[PDB]
Design a protein around this ligand. Structure first.
Ligand SMILES: CCCCCCCCCCCCCCCCCC(=O)OC[C@H](COP(=O)([O-])OCC(O)COP(=O)([O-])OC[C@@H](COC(=O)CCCCCCCCCCCCCCCCC)OC(=O)CCCCCCCCCCCCCCCCC)OC(=O)CCCCCCCCCCCCCCCCC
Ligand SMILES: CCCCCCCCCCCCCCCCCC(=O)OC[C@H](COP(=O)([O-])OCC(O)COP(=O)([O-])OC[C@@H](COC(=O)CCCCCCCCCCCCCCCCC)OC(=O)CCCCCCCCCCCCCCCCC)OC(=O)CCCCCCCCCCCCCCCCC
Ligand SMILES: CCCCCCCCCCCCCCCCCC(=O)OC[C@H](COP(=O)([O-])OCC[N+](C)(C)C)OC(=O)CCCCCCCCCCCCCCCCC
Ligand SMILES: CCCCCCCCCCCCCCCCCC(=O)OC[C@H](COP(=O)([O-])OCC[N+](C)(C)C)OC(=O)CCCCCCCCCCCCCCCCC
Ligand SMILES: CCCCCCCCCCCCCCCCCC(=O)OC[C@H](COP(=O)(O)OCCN)OC(=O)CCCCCCCCCCCCCCCCC
Ligand SMILES: CCCCCCCCCCCCCCCCCC(=O)OC[C@H](COP(=O)(O)OCCN)OC(=O)CCCCCCCCCCCCCCCCC
Ligand SMILES: CCCCCCCCCCCCCCCCCC(=O)OC[C@H](COP(=O)(O)OCCN)OC(=O)CCCCCCCCCCCCCCCCC
Ligand SMILES: CCCCCCCCCCCCCCCCCC(=O)OC[C@H](COP(=O)(O)OCCN)OC(=O)CCCCCCCCCCCCCCCCC
Ligand SMILES: CCCCCCCCCCCCCCCCCC(=O)OC[C@H](COP(=O)(O)OCCN)OC(=O)CCCCCCCCCCCCCCCCC
Ligand SMILES: Nc1nc2c(ncn2[C@@H]2O[C@H](COP(=O)(O)OP(=O)(O)OP(=O)(O)O)[C@@H](O)[C@H]2O)c(=O)[nH]1
Ligand SMILES: [Mg+2]
Lengths: 52, 174, 98, 41, 49, 320, 55, 347, 139, 120
């Protein structure tokens, strides 16, 4: 966000629908859950330039 | 029976060509609701039962219905017909032939690159293999609007109330 | 990509062209806008069902309701224009050239 | 005394445009109060 | 007086005058105290004193 | 707390003040028709506010200390000069005609202000809607240039459109010979030079443009000079009027708020009386404009703003 | 010849004339929604075609 | 309109803009744009004349078309990444679609035609809102996705915006159309440096909003919408016209005024990237904007046009209402150049 | 870009027919774009009037391209100077002269000779020295 | 550049690591210019409102001044902290990447051959 109000106030306003590997109702899995999880765990905290 | 989603999608695009060539708005609305019906069928073939029935009930029976109702009031003295213009025929014909050419190319080549890469290997092919259990995954995802989607409900309800206020502001006419 | 996606994106392109290429009536352009929304709905629904993005199942509902709110607003604008000129013809909406 | 603009000088800026051509000859300055008269009822 | 109608700004708005003076004095006091504690915090973080 | 959005939001509504006798009445007629008596007794016995006809120095009366200012700084036109040399080369005819129309616009705003702020009705002698009678009369006599009636129509169209017409249009009917004898009776030498063609044109404008066109948005009450002296009868017919015509019945607090906002803002009322339409009779050259503005600014109590003029007895400038 | 005529013509007068002509071409528009959105279609197509953007 | 309803509609416009600026999710950003448009349409039609209705209709058409294109870009991005987070776009044609949609919302040059007509057709307060607050949301989205924009497309649109704003404004006698063309040129200046430094975009946006607020509030104070009506203002309130002249000089970017800061910073940041021809073109082209600003200054303050006889009536009257923060806006728009290194606070 | 690539990859002062064809293609394409925008924003009174306007613009631009290419390439190969901005200046001025002929006006022709010649010389300089019109962000 | 910097918490005008820098002096030239801007705002407020520009509403002009100085002090702190962060990161990056920033071998003008261009 341009103004990350959510991360300052600790609120989850729209991050819950932002990826398919987020928590799902009844724990129904996303079709590409493992692939998204692996890409996210690779790309975490190294910046988009490095992650690309 | 082997191909059902492709006839549905081709008819969808045909209806889009029909109403986007813009005949008189009543025939444009007829084309739009035909397109909406075949699209509801498309998403029914993908397991989106609630979403397609939403298309029907709210789009075709709501939004459209209102559109045709409003066209029935603000129209021409002789409300126009499709045939009345050669421009409508030309646009519809060009759209139909660009549909036919590209579907033939995709069917017999399966590697067209019109903006995006496409492969008409089938449409059943992309479906995954698994069990959804004792519930509809679509319905569980949509019913999460009230548990997971609190913010979404807040903003959408506010926008709808604002829409009522806004329509009453604009149409007052003073 | 499968060919249903091809035809859905093609429908969006046709609706966009139909909206950008105007004719006399305003209602025809609004119907082209509605077709653009309907193609977006179907594309979103296909993508969401195919990848089983369960929480994103509600996104087409939100898109539909917001686009219908915009359609109501556009219909009211058309009605005001018609009450001004007796028709919804866009060529009457030219007095801002001067 | 110092020259100051007169009516002939002021009316260069009272037209529909700043550079009047043939394609804008039919252009008129918009209404003072921004309202156009109602058309035939 | 001189004017027929009573001027809106004929007498000072005493509530607004008092509020203006008070808020200015508070702003100055708060600024001075903040600068004092800020110099103190800088000196103790940096080990200067 | 000037009437604004914050006042209207809490509890400021005008319908709770509006009553059966909360009406604006305009009395009208040719010169020396006696509108003064009818209007003044109508106001006094119906319990309304009287507004004497808007003169050159009406604006000077509603601002400052209420005393008339020099003709150079206010008006810049004369009525005696119009009666002596109506076809003079100064353009004084239409300069006077525009100045007194602007004064009438100011007075109509001031009267609607009182009505919408207190609830009391008002009575006026002539108004913006009957100012054109003199303009057409001057035009038929060939005083104003045809350019100078188009400008008048522009100003009237863009200003008078914003306001509500009178509830009641009372007209006093006097024939031209009797008006002439009354002018010859009061002895004003400038009035003594008024030709019968001018008065006839005024009466014709009244009868053929003013009175018929008020008849569709207000109730028009015509009395000749015999029935105009019986103010009891006039107000009895005033009280018997249904007043179910015009825009006044279909007025709610939302429109009254906007009307009060416009009407309280005098600079917005007079906005279009100074449109940039350069007619020699009313255009002021830059040197004269600058000089006369400086001499106005030099007036006591006129330089800064009301309450900030120490030279006139204003205290506490430094705490305001 | 030089100061009042050609030195005027070369830099300031011709530049001013060009700016005035461009202003007339740009500013004088029909005020029609239809023509504006047709030009929008042209711009959109050009951005998705020879002007190599989507590629 | 009802004062409560007008306040609510204004608040809904600002809340749509804030929804755009605080969301990490593309659907919520689209929702914010939708809400902003929905609440914005009635404030355009506040006066309700055929000009106001046509301005609102053209505004609605352009903004709705842009919003649909934006949604299509989002859907293509999701189709190829499954990502809803506003971040770099993973598809090039989706990126092109999004860039065109955001430029159409902003009113950049190939999509600029709506700005002059809509600004002319609405009131000065509506135009003030249109040319200041409505630029925030698309520019914030652009600053968020700047790392994936095509520099060629963006720079083309920005240069065209500068050129067209300069040329179109040359022909105008209407103050609202002059403001609109100045806005087009300033949007071009903002979006040219966007590929290189978004801090420069934010700085230029703040300076432009200050100048536009000052100028529109001076126009509202003057009640003038044509150049000749403004030419009468000296004979009523010469302070307003002198302040307007210094503000117009600031808009032209003349040193040592505040309007010179964004141009100077943007030229520096562009030359840091081996961009020399484009900054020279941009600075040279801005002389057109300065030319018609100087024309307005000539007609308003530096010379005295003929007045009218009815102006003596207006001399005896004060303003019922007073523009809020106008002295602050005037000082900020003219005098802040010595404070330039404070721009790093925007980092 | 392939339209410009085919012009750019063939060396200067060689194969003047190919270079003339490439510049003619660029001219025709640009004239087609300007005709599209002119037809959109200032529509004609008939389809044939629009076709005539399109052909007029397209031939003017294509003739400017062909003339620029012919003169630039021939003056390069005749003088054996393929890196000199002067051949491009001569090309730009000949393009200005043919634009003046197309509008049939000596003043437009002379002004266009000067402006387009200087522009083309600048373009040659930027090619030789690696000037960027759209520089990619680096810092 | 600085948007995605690690540790950068949202909506925080001065982070707590800024308290390590010296706060700006009270007679800081930039702060005094802030006060001057406030004073000009007060004068222009008197001018527009049609009051005596120098002697009307001393409380209002005074408040203009103190509020401008109040905002300017915190603006100066944030600006100085941003520049301190910039230098901090630059020195850290030069340290972590010695290969990108070699130690240039210094030479004197007695061994360096500079070309002489005559003016004649
Ligand atoms: C703002 C206050 C508006 C107001 O008086 O509302 C009263 C409100 C509505 O009254 P109304 O009679 O229905 O409407 C009157 C009109 O607003 C017309 O009344 P007016 O003629 O007094 O209006 C002057 C005009 C001109 O504006 C003003 O006079 C004040 C607003 C502009 C300056 C202050 C805002 C910007 C400050 C930061 C600047 C950068 C640093 O005001 C507006 O246009 C207000 C528009 C709505 C408010 C939001 C405006 C945002 C503009 C800046 C956007 C960018 C900000 C940075 C990002 O009534 C209430 O009771 C509340
Ligand atoms: C960091 C934070 C800095 C600010 C801290 C707080 C300062 C006081 C807050 C209240 C305040 O100034 O409200 C101004 C606020 C602004 O509206 P306005 O139309 O500009 O008022 C001017 C009238 O002359 C107002 O005349 P009046 O007679 O109606 O009232 C006198 C007025 C005194 O009003 C003033 O002094 C006007 C405001 C002066 C400062 C405004 C901006 C302050 C922030 C700095 C902006 C510039 C930054 C420059 C650097 C940018 C980056 C390089 O004081 C008050 O009304 C009471 C104030 C306490 C409550 O006015 C009111 O609250 C009264 C109406
Ligand atoms: C005015 C709007 C008021 C909305 C209702 C108040 C909040 C209702 C509620 O319980 O929300 C819980 C919800 C969710 O919290 P929760 O404690 O119910 O946890 C939900 C957990 N899942 C998603 C797994 C089911 O609150 C929010 O999501 C906050 C959103 C912002 C609310 C802003 C209101 C203003
Ligand atoms: C005149 C010369 C100077 C020109 C510029 C003057 C600017 C005056 C106002 C400065 C206000 C503070 C500037 C930064 C800001 O708005 O927020 C800082 C921010 C507040 O949150 P912020 O960073 O979201 O706010 C700015 C918006 N972006 C992200 C584009 C920078 O400070 C932080 O520490 C937040 C960092 C993480 C954000 C997530
Ligand atoms: C299919 C392309 C369009 C066509 O053949 O004709 C459309 C149009 C007809 O001409 P006209 O009626 O003038 O169009 C404007 C009406 N208001 O055509 C035109 O307006 C002119 C289009 C000219 C295109 C030339 C292409 C080479
Ligand atoms: C130089 C070459 C010789 C002169 C130009 C060619 C001869 C000629 O006819 O020139 C005049 C020309 C006539 O054409 P004309 O009818 O005006 O054009 C419109 C037609 N529809 O009309 C024209 O407009 C053509 C002008 C051609 C360019 C003239 C350049 C010379 C004049 C400026 C010289 C000095 C410049 C400054 C020098 C340095 C500073 C001191
Ligand atoms: C036609 C003008 C633009 C031509 C163009 O493509 O410019 C891009 C250019 C970089 O490429 P270019 O030099 O054209 O081709 C060889 C690259 N080694 O970038 C350049 O800067 C070279 C061409 C433009 C040089 C400046 C021309 C005047 C600008 C004002
Ligand atoms: C004015 C109206 C027309 C404006 C639009 C012109 C064409 C813009 C789209 C194509 C731009 C392009 O790609 O140009 C390529 C060329 C050299 O490439 P460069 O600009 O450095 O960008 C490299 C990005 N990877 O750079 C160029 O060709 C320079 C631009 C030439 C414009 C003529
Ligand atoms: C260019 C200068 C750049 C630097 C300064 C930036 C601008 C600052 C001022 C902005 C404009 C404010 C005044 C606007 C104006 O034009 O006012 C006209 C007015 C003419 O006279 P009049 O209106 O009759 O005066 C009434 C009583 N003062 O004017 C005046 O009355 C006075 C106009 C000048 C303002 C006063 C200057 C001297 C004031 C005393 C010294 C102030 C030093 C600062 C510290 C003050 C501490 C109390
Ligand atoms: N030129 C001109 N003179 C006007 C106008 N309105 C009023 N007057 C003059 O105002 C003067 C005042 O006298 P009037 O109000 O006409 O009449 P009166 O003498 O009061 O007599 P009654 O009408 O019976 O009340 C007359 O000399 C009018 O001609 C106007 O619009 N134009
Ligand atoms: Mg009378």
């Amino acid at each position: 966000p341009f103004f990350d109000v959510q991360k300052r106030l600790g609120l989850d306003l729209d991050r819950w629908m932002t990826i398919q590997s987020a928590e799902q109702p009844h724990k129904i899995p996303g079709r590409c859950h493992a692939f998204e999880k692996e890409w996210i765990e690779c790309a975490h905290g190294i910046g988009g330039i490095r992650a690309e | 029976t082997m191909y059902i989603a492709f006839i549905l999608s081709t008819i969808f695009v045909i209806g889009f060509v029909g109403f986007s060539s813009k005949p008189s708005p009543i025939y444009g609305g007829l084309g739009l609701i035909v397109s909406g019906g075949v699209g509801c069928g498309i998403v029914l073939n993908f397991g989106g039962s609630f979403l397609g029935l939403m298309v029907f009930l709210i789009y075709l029976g709501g939004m459209l219905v209102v559109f045709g109702y409003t066209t029935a009031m603000a129209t021409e003295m002789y409300p126009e017909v499709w045939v009345s213009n050669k421009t409508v025929f030309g646009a519809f014909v060009s759209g139909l032939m660009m549909e036919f050419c590209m579907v033939y190319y995709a069917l017999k080549e399966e590697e067209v690159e019109i903006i995006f890469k496409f492969n008409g290997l089938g449409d059943w092919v992309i479906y995954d293999t698994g069990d959804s259990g004792f519930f509809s995954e679509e319905a569980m995802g949509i019913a999460a609007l009230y548990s997971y989607g609190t913010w979404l409900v807040i903003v959408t309800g506010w926008s709808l109330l604002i829409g009522v206020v806004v329509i009453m502001e604009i149409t007052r006419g003073n | 990509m499968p060919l249903v996606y091809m035809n859905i994106i093609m429908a969006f392109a046709i609706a966009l062209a139909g909206l950008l290429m105007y004719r006399s009536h305003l209602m025809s352009s609004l119907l082209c806008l509605e077709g653009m929304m309907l193609s977006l709905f179907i594309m979103s629904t296909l993508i969401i069902l195919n990848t089983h993005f369960t929480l994103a199942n509600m996104m087409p509902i939100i898109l539909l309701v917001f686009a219908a709110c915009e359609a109501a607003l556009g219909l009211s604008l058309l009605v005001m224009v018609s009450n001004t000129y007796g028709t919804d013809y866009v060529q009457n909406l030219n007095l801002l050239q001067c | 005394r110092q020259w100051q603009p007169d009516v002939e000088w002021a009316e260069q800026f009272g037209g529909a445009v700043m550079y009047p051509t043939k394609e804008t000859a039919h252009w008129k300055p918009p209404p003072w109060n921004d309202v156009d008269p109602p058309k035939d009822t | 007086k001189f004017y027929i109608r009573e001027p809106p700004h004929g007498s000072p708005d005493w509530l607004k005058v008092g509020l203006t003076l008070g808020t200015s004095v508070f702003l100055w006091i708060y600024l001075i105290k903040q600068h004092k504690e800020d110099v103190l915090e800088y000196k103790r973080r940096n080990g200067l004193e | 707390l000037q009437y604004g959005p914050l006042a209207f939001v809490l509890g400021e509504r005008t319908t709770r003040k509006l009553t059966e006798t909360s009406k604006v009445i305009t009395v009208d007629g040719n010169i020396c028709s006696g509108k003064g008596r009818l209007a003044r007794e109508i106001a006094e016995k119906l319990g309304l506010r009287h507004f004497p006809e808007a003169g050159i120095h009406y604006a000077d009366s509603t601002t400052g200390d209420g005393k008339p200012l020099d003709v150079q700084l206010s008006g810049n036109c004369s009525l005696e000069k119009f009666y002596d040399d109506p076809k003079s080369n100064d353009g004084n005819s239409y300069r006077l005609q525009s100045w007194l129309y602007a004064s009438r616009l100011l007075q109509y705003a001031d009267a609607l202000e009182h009505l919408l702020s207190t609830g009391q009705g008002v009575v006026l002698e002539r108004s913006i809607y009957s100012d054109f009678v003199f303009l057409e009369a001057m035009y038929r006599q060939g005083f104003i240039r045809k350019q100078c009636v188009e400008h008048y129509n522009e100003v009237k169209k863009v200003t008078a459109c914003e306001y509500l017409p009178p509830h009641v249009v009372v007209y006093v009917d006097v024939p031209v010979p009797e008006i002439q004898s009354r002018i010859q009776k009061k002895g004003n030498p400038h009035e003594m030079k008024i030709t019968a063609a001018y008065l006839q044109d005024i009466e014709n404008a009244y009868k053929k443009t003013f009175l018929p066109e008020m008849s569709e948005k207000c109730e028009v009450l015509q009395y000749s000079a015999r029935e105009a002296e019986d103010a009891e009868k006039v107000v009895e017919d005033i009280e018997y009027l249904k007043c179910d015509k015009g825009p006044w019945p279909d007025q709610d607090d939302r429109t009254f708020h906007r009307l009060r906002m416009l009407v309280q803002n005098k600079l917005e009322v007079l906005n279009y009386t100074t449109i940039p339409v350069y007619l020699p009779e009313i255009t002021i050259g830059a040197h004269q404009s600058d000089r006369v503005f400086q001499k106005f600014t030099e007036l006591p109590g006129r330089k800064y703003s009301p309450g900030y003029n120490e030279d006139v007895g204003d205290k506490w400038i430094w705490l305001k | 010849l030089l100061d009042l005529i050609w030195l005027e013509t070369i830099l300031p007068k011709t530049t001013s004339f060009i700016q005035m002509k461009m202003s007339i071409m740009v500013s004088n528009q029909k005020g029609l929604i239809k023509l504006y959105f047709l030009s929008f279609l042209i711009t959109i197509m050009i951005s998705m075609t020879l002007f190599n953007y989507h590629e | 309109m009802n004062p409560i309803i007008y306040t609510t509609l204004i608040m809904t416009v600002m809340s749509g803009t804030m929804l755009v600026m605080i969301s990490s999710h593309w659907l919520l950003i689209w929702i914010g744009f939708e809400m902003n448009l929905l609440a914005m349409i009635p404030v355009l039609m506040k006066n309700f004349n055929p000009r106001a209705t046509e301005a609102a209709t053209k505004y609605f058409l352009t903004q709705a078309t842009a919003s649909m294109m934006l949604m299509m870009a989002i859907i293509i991005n999701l189709l190829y990444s499954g990502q809803w987070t506003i971040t770099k776009m993973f598809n090039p044609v989706a990126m092109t679609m999004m860039t065109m949609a955001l430029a159409m919302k902003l009113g950049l040059s190939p999509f600029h035609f709506w700005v002059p007509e809509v600004t002319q057709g609405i009131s000065l307060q509506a135009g003030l809102l249109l040319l200041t607050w409505q630029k925030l949301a698309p520019l914030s989205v652009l600053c968020q996705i700047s790392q994936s924009i095509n520099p060629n497309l963006m720079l083309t649109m920005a240069m065209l915006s500068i050129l067209i704003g300069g040329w179109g404004g040359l022909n105008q006698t209407q103050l609202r159309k002059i403001m609109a063309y100045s806005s087009i040129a300033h949007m071009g200046w903002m979006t040219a440096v966007l590929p290189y430094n978004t801090t420069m975009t934010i700085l230029n946006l703040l300076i432009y909003i200050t100048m536009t607020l000052a100028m529109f509030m001076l126009l509202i104070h003057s009640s003038a919408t044509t150049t000749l009506s403004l030419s009468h203002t000296w004979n009523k309130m010469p302070v307003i016209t002198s302040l307007m002249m210094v503000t117009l000089l600031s808009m032209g970017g003349l040193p040592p005024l505040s309007g010179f800061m964004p141009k100077w910073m943007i030229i520096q940041e562009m030359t840091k990237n081996e961009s020399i021809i484009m900054p020279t073109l941009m600075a040279m082209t801005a002389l057109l904007n300065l030319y018609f600003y100087m024309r307005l200054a000539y007609s308003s303050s530096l010379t005295m046009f003929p007045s009218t006889n009815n102006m003596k009536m207006k001399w005896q009257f004060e303003h019922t209402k007073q523009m809020k923060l106008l002295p602050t806006m005037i000082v900020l728009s003219t005098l802040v150049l010595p404070m330039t290194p404070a721009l790093s606070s925007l980092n | 870009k392939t339209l410009l690539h085919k012009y750019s990859d063939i060396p200067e002062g060689t194969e003047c027919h190919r270079k003339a064809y490439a510049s003619t293609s660029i001219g025709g394409a640009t004239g087609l774009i300007v005709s599209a925008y002119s037809i959109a924003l200032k529509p004609p009174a008939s389809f044939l009037e629009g076709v005539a306007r399109t052909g007029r613009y397209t031939f003017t631009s294509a003739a400017i391209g062909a003339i620029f290419g012919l003169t630039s390439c021939i003056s390069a190969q005749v003088r054996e100077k393929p890196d000199d901005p002067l051949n491009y200046f001569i090309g730009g001025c000949a393009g200005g002269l043919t634009l003046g002929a197309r509008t049939r006006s000596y003043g437009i022709g002379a002004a266009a000779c000067a402006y387009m010649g200087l522009t083309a010389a600048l373009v040659k300089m930027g090619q030789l020295e690696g000037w960027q019109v759209f520089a990619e962000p680096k810092v | 550049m600085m948007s995605g910097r690690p540790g950068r918490v949202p909506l925080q005008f001065l982070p707590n690591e800024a308290r390590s820098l010296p706060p700006p002096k009270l007679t800081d030239p930039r702060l005094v210019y802030m006060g001057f801007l406030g004073y000009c705002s007060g004068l222009i407020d008197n001018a527009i409102r049609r009051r005596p520009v120098v002697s009307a509403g001393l409380h209002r002009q005074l408040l203009y001044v103190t509020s401008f100085v109040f905002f300017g002090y915190y603006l100066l702190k944030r600006q100085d902290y941003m520049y301190a962060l910039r230098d901090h990161d630059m020195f850290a990056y030069v340290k972590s990447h010695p290969e990108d920033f070699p130690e240039k071998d210094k030479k004197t003008y007695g061994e360096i051959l500079e070309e002489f261009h005559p003016v004649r």
